[PDB]
Subunit: 150 residues, 6 copies
């Protein structure tokens, strides 16, 4: 359905490099609707929860400390296949390997400084959206441009 | 040669979503010469003729209603490899699968609302071009930036 | 109601400089709806009546000849104060004196090559509109983004 | 000082027209730092408080009901003379009168649908920032690009 | 005539803030022909010579340190009314007072960090051009888009 | 460390088509720092050694003559994987086969007029860099946005 949501986050580097506007603008242009938005400096528990799957990985520590090293603008976009689409718009883990046209392909160079993060699955999305947003911070009844869906 | 032409059309949704100029500019920048251009509200006939290959397809009815539910800015661009290039610049049938950087990859989400249509071959182009444009509506004197061709 | 319409034309230089999509995009972004659009090579007769008010001025001859030199994409945008707004967005007759942000202020240098033309009054909008477009080439059913008007 | 803040808000129309990204991007580009950000549907009391100065004005009722008619993304930018600068970037109350280059000059047409709102004074800014944001939702220790200030 | 030249310089902050291409593109679009271009870290002399008119001014010392604290991409654009046009496109000394659409109006906040510098007169231009460029670093064969001049 | 450098050149067609700022902006946006930059009219000798590897190929003659036809803005960008990344951002030798989002995929059509040139390896980067730039024309002190690298 056209009510599928995803969690996206302009990481501390993207925020610091002033990419928030550019990133939100790209998602709005593709037609996805913003249903949650806020700037915050992630807490250590939020970062370790958000990235729980890499808790065993070696970069985990440097990932968590970085994600909490500055303000992040967490957001949730809604729309048909948004989880997979948003990812496509993001690129690949390594911005060098990311194709021009994609967010990381256009703005990134380092894997640890890859501007933005997004859910990799609908299941990861629903969980992460609940980690970073309270139900009341999320739009309930949505209305995208009627020229977006059949 | 560089006299090749393709037919392109900003669908009612692309027009309504304010993407007409966005689309024309992308072809102008690539170096294709706009040889014909007009805004029309397609008739059922033109649309059914245009999409005659999908006439037995389940989506035909909804498409023919869509394409004729409002304005369409039909255009013809000329240049070397234009038909295949234009398509590459458009993306894929499903906008969601279309890569960032391509028109549908940047602006679409629904297959029925895929912003733009273009010829899939020189044979298709020649028939669609003659389908939407009268000879007098297409330039004879075409000359692109001299820095475009060797 | 705000169904006011203005006539605009990307002159041969603007068309040749590949700024058609750019100009159209600026008016689409503003909120104006395209109710007419076409590319033609203006006839000395249309050019002459178009600029009938300058028929006595010394630049007339070179002007009529310029506008008729090549393709022009004529268009009519409808909207609340579109005549005066479109002009503001154009700049001044002298591209150099046109402020940055305006079409001529961003893309022009010479007065004879000022990229775009537009009606200076509703009186002239209606006159020039009726000059370049047949009623059947213009939209009856005009519907802009509902977030544009109160 | 370079720690001056202002309250800005992409109104329901700007949000609905997908201008959030574009607006935030303009402020980030001028060099102002984001110190507060969130999407919410203003409450009636928030709107009437925010616009308390027009409570006696005739448009007040339609202004309040509109501002609360949809989600708004309230934000606070910090920087040297940001209150006056942000306004300059906004334009004038009437988007038609707003110069090209400014937010309303580029995107608006109606006074009731003027895309964005911002503080008109440092004193109005500090109050409004407190109406829409809790101290904990605002960045305390700020760090803009060091190439921004002397 | 259209052989006039002005000297422009993306200051260390503009360079560091990643605005070099942004600036060059704006002059290319306006129709000015880049006649010389290089990236250099200005010497105290070049800078003190360059800003000799402010040598007794309180801000001279801090300016001469700034302008020489990193790379500067000095350039010379040629074209009709270029010196006055370039300045118009730049804005005013104080970026905060510079209107949206102009370079400083869009990207600056501090007077000491005003992104770009340009000649204020043909006499100033001719001296600054000869100050930063050797004759062999400037084109002799200049030819702009033929759609630029009558 | 990520001080890898590549040589890039907006060819005579790219320069003539006014795409210098656009190209530079795309690399500045990515995070690469310009450690060298100049506009010159390549000499047959430099052009010939530059393309020494194609000295036997049949297109050589017209190539050497083209690159030397007019101004070229040579540049060297430094950064993590800049050689391979810059290439990815360029597209493929054939502009038409170059994907949208890439420089050639967005602006080119002919193989002889492919807007931009760039090193295909660190070996060639270092060779071509030493070919077009004197050590004193290149930066020693390179400092990119600290949010770029870990
Ligand atoms: N070895 C690495 N070095 C540093 N950080 C890494 C590495 N691999 C993963 N990361 C970071 O952790 C984030 C989470 O990892 P992962 O979920 O695999 O990436 P993503 O979902 O963004 O593609 C990555 O986006 C990247 O910033
Ligand atoms: N399964 C479908 N459901 C809905 N509309 C579709 C479907 N497949 C194609 N379309 C519509 O019909 C138009 C014509 O179909 P087709 O020629 O297959 O697409 P294209 O050539 O644009 O990739 C489409 O681009 C789209 O608007
Ligand atoms: N003295 C001039 N020299 C050449 N062309 C001129 C001159 N003044 C006006 N023009 C041209 O004639 C067009 C029509 O005249 P006018 O209505 O005064 O211009 P506009 O309405 O576009 O400002 C101008 O936009 C410009 O191309
Ligand atoms: N008469 C009007 N009609 C409708 N709404 C109005 C009118 N004048 C003011 N407004 C709205 O109320 C907002 C608040 O008014 P005001 O504070 O004067 O404007 P601003 O501060 O945005 O310039 C205006 O931006 C505009 O949206
Ligand atoms: N009061 C000031 N304080 C700091 N720097 C200033 C001051 N006024 C001018 N500048 C700096 O010195 C440069 C040269 O001054 P000036 O020629 O007056 O400016 P411009 O011609 O760029 O408007 C400035 O643009 C700016 O970097
Ligand atoms: N067969 C061809 N015809 C004309 N020019 C060619 C051809 N193949 C390569 N070129 C030109 O020579 C340049 C140098 O050759 P090559 O190194 O293969 O290209 P690149 O590295 O840019 O992909 C090309 O970018 C293109 O302008
Ligand atoms: Mg992940
Ligand atoms: Mg088809
Ligand atoms: Mg007139
Ligand atoms: Mg107010
Ligand atoms: Mg000065
Ligand atoms: Mg090569």
């Amino acid at each position: 359905v056209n009510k599928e949501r995803t969690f996206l986050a302009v990481k501390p580097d993207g925020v610091a490099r002033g990419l928030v506007g550019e990133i939100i603008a790209r998602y709005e242009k593709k037609g996805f609707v913003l249903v949650g938005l806020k700037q915050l400096v992630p807490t250590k528990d939020l970062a370790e929860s958000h990235y729980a799957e890499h808790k065993e990985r070696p970069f985990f520590g440097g990932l968590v400390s970085f994600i909490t090293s500055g303000p992040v603008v967490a957001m949730v976009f809604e729309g048909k296949g948004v989880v997979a689409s948003a990812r496509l718009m993001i690129g690949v883990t390594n911005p060098l390997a990311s194709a021009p046209g994609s967010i990381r392909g256009d703005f990134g160079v380092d894997v640890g400084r890859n501007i933005i993060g997004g859910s990799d699955s609908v299941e990861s999305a629903n969980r992460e959206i609940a980690l970073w947003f309270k139900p009341e911070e999320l739009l309930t009844e949505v209305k995208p441009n009627p020229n977006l869906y059949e």
